[PDB]
């Protein structure tokens, strides 16, 4: 995080003070794929 | 002399003086702090 | 199902100068440190990389909501509440008085800025990098930069007026 | 002071989109320069609290004998029996004055307990020392001698003070109780604090409702442009949306900066009134109250101060 | 756009196709100039209000003695000496601060012969033995005379009065 | 004080064009904010008197 | 007009004061179609 202050301020010397560099965010791990159920079917057995 | 420039597409307008810096043998052109054309090597003669 | 976005917030770095030391203190602002993955929880956010103490001294680097920080002593970054000064009350009665018997003459400096650097930006060279094809469509936008030339002259006529 | 806000260009502009942050780098550093101005007004409001409340660093305290010549100062002083260090007027001052798009609200440096500890230290120095604790070390001056000098600043001799000591202190304690009856009933008396919090609230919801607009695109949803359209024909709709969201973000930083210029002129007027009406006797006419000014008692307020100016009429 | 150099846009693309990349460089550079001059005019307003505060400090602290508190320095203002500086004025404010104090006893009036004697200049102080007159910012005890006091009413209406005599200077001058 | 002024969103941008007025709705409530800033000016010019 | 103040303020309760709602303009009713006169004609009867 000392080098993160140099990466944002574009300087190789950091003075005494409070500096904001970036933001933390939790990355998504899984992916929920949903669909409706097996109700409301079609009578395909009448021709097949 | 204030002339026009045409160096393989790198156009510009200004004068040409002798450079005193060190340069690379593969270098086509350099850039300043504004990231624009400021130093051009000749494609035939090699004067930066 | 209740859709809530997952935990996010700003990251700030509390550090002294590079000529003094190199230790940092990561502040997850707005983020509790039970949801992040030698630690202290504040109101602005849980602080990672500072030793919390009970005494309060004169600090230099503020954090937020009363919590402040400084670099003290085998040295590390500590964090404490902001001190409001030394408590020294004055007594009171109905028949006593306190008269000064001596004084001191001090000189206290006060610095007020008056003027600034007068600049002037032209429309032909800043927008067009010695280009002739740029200037023909510059006339199609009317009078934007003529008003910016009057504003920059109106600033610069106030700077010698302020002197 | 005002409300400290901070917004990022990662979450407000891009609604969890990886292609939106890649086209944000082509525009340069538009969101970097407004980030430097938003921390410039964040440390300015923290400096405005130190310029008004933190005039002296020595914390004073009241004596337990609450007898100042028949003067009832229990209403403007904070109650130590309460867990919150607030006054009887200040319990009504904090009562009348009352998300996920990257907008955050920073807490200030001085809290409400630290402001009222600075307020009660300036209030205890007013009744026990008067005008001497704002000019160096505090001295022990009685309350009968403090009204002799403050009458002498407006050309009033001390003979009306001691011959009418029962009539002056009954007029002050009835007027202090008339403040508490008017502040508990009339909620529109604190409208100078109310437009500070309402203009900051109406600036925040217009940042949210401008995201629903399209700015000339076919949709305001960043997922609907990228998933449905062809990617060289979709990216001209991103540049319409990233320009309209930046210009509303460039609108919000410019209206807050002139509001920062308006809140700097009032806090410099407040720090002048903290040094002239509280720390001494002002010889101006209609500055610390309409008429001949005697003394003042400052009170804490949400994003402001409340002055109890007494006047000689 | 595709590039930042304006010569690379015109000499590579069609003049119906390079013009739409040209106005992105025109309105992109004009918007960066517009946020510069609005930040300039906001900074021109706060540098005017500090210079008007400096002109008020040049008129009250330098050209005379201002009776304000915490305006020409912390404490009682005596004089000021301005100094030159780049883009501002640095003021050297001379102030009056008391350092050492001492506790005494006091009373608002003196009952001499049934009438109350109020102090004209200064306050009534005592060192435990006698009663004296000194000011509020410095210690300089003086004897209580009729020239330093003025009579106002009796002793029954004021609160805190003590019994002491007032030295009348005309009384030893009749036999001297 | 100064001269109190007001601007219309529909009339200044669109010179009596019905196809210009419905295309301002895609920009949202942005031109109301320039209208609400100038009406807030016209209150405090009466306060300065 | 009381309900006109509710739509522009986005609130179901309107307080005491003066509020601006919209703008009045007289709509056009007719359309004057004009053409130049029947002079400067050409001799079409020389072939017809």
UniProtKB/Swiss-Prot annotation, chain D:
Sites carrying a glycan are 72
Cite the residue spans of the region called Heptad repeat 1: 165-215
Q: Which domain of life is it from?
A: Viruses
Q: What is the effect of changing residue 272 to I?
A: In strain: Gamma/P.1
Q: Where is this site: Cleavage?
A: 86-87
- What are the annotated disulfide bridges? 9-31, 14-20, 277-288
Q: What is the effect of changing residue 195 to N?
A: In strain: Delta/B.1.617.2, Mu/B.1.621
Parts forming coiled coils: 194-238
According to its UniProt entry, the function of this protein is described as: Precursor of the fusion protein processed in the biosynthesis of the S protein and the formation of virus particle. Mediates fusion of the virion and cellular membranes by functioning as a class I viral fusion protein. Contains two viral fusion peptides that are unmasked after cleavage. The S2/S2' cleavage occurs during virus entry at the cell membrane by host TMPRSS2 or during endocytosis by host CSTL.
Official protein name in the record: Spike protein S2
Q: What are the leading ranks of the lineage? A: Viruses, Riboviria, Orthornavirae, Pisuviricota, Pisoniviricetes
Q: Which residues of the full protein are shown?
A: 730 to 1068 of 1273
UniProtKB/Swiss-Prot annotation, chain F:
Disulfide linkages recorded for this protein, renumbered to the chain, are 9-31, 14-20
Q: Which domain of life is it from?
A: Viruses
Role noted for this protein: Precursor of the fusion protein processed in the biosynthesis of the S protein and the formation of virus particle. Mediates fusion of the virion and cellular membranes by functioning as a class I viral fusion protein. Contains two viral fusion peptides that are unmasked after cleavage. The S2/S2' cleavage occurs during virus entry at the cell membrane by host TMPRSS2 or during endocytosis by host CSTL.
Q: What is this protein called?
A: Spike protein S2
Q: Which residues of the full protein are shown?
A: 730 to 778 of 1273
């Amino acid at each position: 995080p000392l080098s993160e202050t140099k990466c944002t301020l574009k300087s190789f010397t950091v003075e005494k003070g409070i500096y904001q560099t970036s933001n933390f965010r939790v990355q998504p791990t899984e992916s929920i794929v949903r669909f409706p159920n097996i109700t409301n079917l079609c009578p395909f057995d009448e021709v097949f | 002399k204030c002339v026009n420039f045409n160096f393989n597409g790198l156009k510009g307008t200004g004068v040409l003086t002798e450079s005193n810096k060190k340069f690379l043998p593969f270098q086509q052109f350099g850039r300043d702090i504004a990231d624009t054309t400021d130093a051009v090597r000749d494609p035939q003669t090699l004067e930066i | 199902l209740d859709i809530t976005p997952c935990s996010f917030g700003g990251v700030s770095v509390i550090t002294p100068g590079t000529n003094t030391s190199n230790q940092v203190a990561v502040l997850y602002q707005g983020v509790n440190c039970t949801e992040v993955p030698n630690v202290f929880q504040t109101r602005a956010g849980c602080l990672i990389g500072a030793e919390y103490v009970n005494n309060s001294y004169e600090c230099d680097i503020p954090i937020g909501a009363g919590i402040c920080a400084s670099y003290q002593t085998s040295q590390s970054i500590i964090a404490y509440t902001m001190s409001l000064g030394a408590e020294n009350s004055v007594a009171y009665s109905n028949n006593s008085i306190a008269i000064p018997t001596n004084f001191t003459i001090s000189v206290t400096t006060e610095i007020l800025p008056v003027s600034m650097t007068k600049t002037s930006v032209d429309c032909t060279m800043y927008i067009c990098g010695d280009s002739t094809e740029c200037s023909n469509l510059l006339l199609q936008y009317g009078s934007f930069c003529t008003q910016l030339k009057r504003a920059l002259t109106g600033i610069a006529v106030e700077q010698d007026k302020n002197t | 002071s005002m409300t400290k806000t901070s917004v990022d260009c990662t979450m407000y502009i891009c609604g969890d989109s990886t292609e939106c942050s890649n086209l944000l780098l082509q525009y340069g550093s538009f969101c970097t320069q407004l980030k430097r101005a938003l921390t410039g007004i964040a440390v300015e409001q923290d400096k405005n609290t130190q310029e008004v409340f933190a005039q002296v660093k020595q914390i004073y305290k009241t004596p337990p004998i609450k007898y100042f010549g028949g003067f009832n100062f229990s209403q403007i002083l904070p109650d130590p029996s309460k867990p919150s260090k607030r006054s009887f007027i200040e319990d009504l001052l904090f009562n009348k004055v009352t998300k996920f798009k990257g907008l955050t609200v920073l807490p200030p440096l001085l809290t409400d307990e630290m402001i009222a500890q600075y307020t009660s230290a300036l209030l205890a120095g007013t009744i026990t020392s008067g005008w001497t604790f704002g000019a160096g070390a505090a001295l022990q001056i009685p309350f009968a001698m403090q009204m002799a000098y403050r009458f002498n600043g407006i050309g009033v001799t001390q003979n009306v003070l001691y011959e009418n000591q029962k009539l002056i202190a009954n007029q002050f304690n009835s007027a202090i109780g008339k403040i508490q009856d008017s502040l508990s009933s009339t909620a529109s008396a604190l409208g100078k604090l109310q437009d500070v919090v309402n203009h900051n609230a109406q600036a925040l919801n217009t940042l949210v409702k401008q995201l629903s607009s399209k700015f000339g695109a076919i949709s305001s949803v960043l997922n609907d442009i990228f998933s449905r359209l062809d990617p060289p024909e979709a990216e001209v709709q991103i540049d319409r949306l990233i320009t309209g969201r930046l210009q509303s973000l460039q609108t919000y930083v410019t209206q807050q900066l002139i509001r920062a210029a308006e809140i700097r002129a009032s806090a410099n007027l407040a720090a002048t009134k903290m040094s002239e009406c509280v720390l001494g006797q002002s010889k101006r006419v209609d500055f610390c109250g309409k008429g001949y000014h005697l003394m003042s008692f400052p009170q804490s307020a949400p994003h402001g101060v409340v002055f109890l100016h007494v006047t000689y009429v | 756009a595709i590039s930042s150099v304006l010569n690379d846009i015109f000499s590579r693309l069609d003049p119906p196709e390079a013009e739409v990349q040209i106005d992105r460089l025109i309105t992109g550079r004009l918007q960066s100039l517009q946020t510069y001059v609005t930040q300039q005019l906001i900074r021109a307003a706060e540098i005017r209000a500090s210079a008007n505060l400096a002109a008020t400090k040049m008129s009250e602290c330098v050209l005379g003695q201002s009776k304000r508190v915490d305006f020409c320095g912390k404490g009682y203002h005596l004089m000021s000496f301005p100094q030159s500086a780049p883009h501002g004025v640095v003021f050297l404010h001379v102030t009056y601060v008391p350092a050492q104090e001492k506790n005494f006893t006091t009373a608002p009036a003196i009952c001499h012969d049934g009438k109350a004697h109020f102090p004209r200049e200064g306050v009534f102080v005592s060192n435990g033995t006698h009663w004296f007159v000194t000011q509020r910012n410095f210690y300089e005890p003086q004897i209580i005379t009729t020239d330093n006091t003025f009579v106002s009413g009796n002793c029954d209406v004021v609160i805190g009065i003590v019994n002491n005599t007032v030295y009348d200077p005309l009384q030893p001058e009749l036999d001297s």
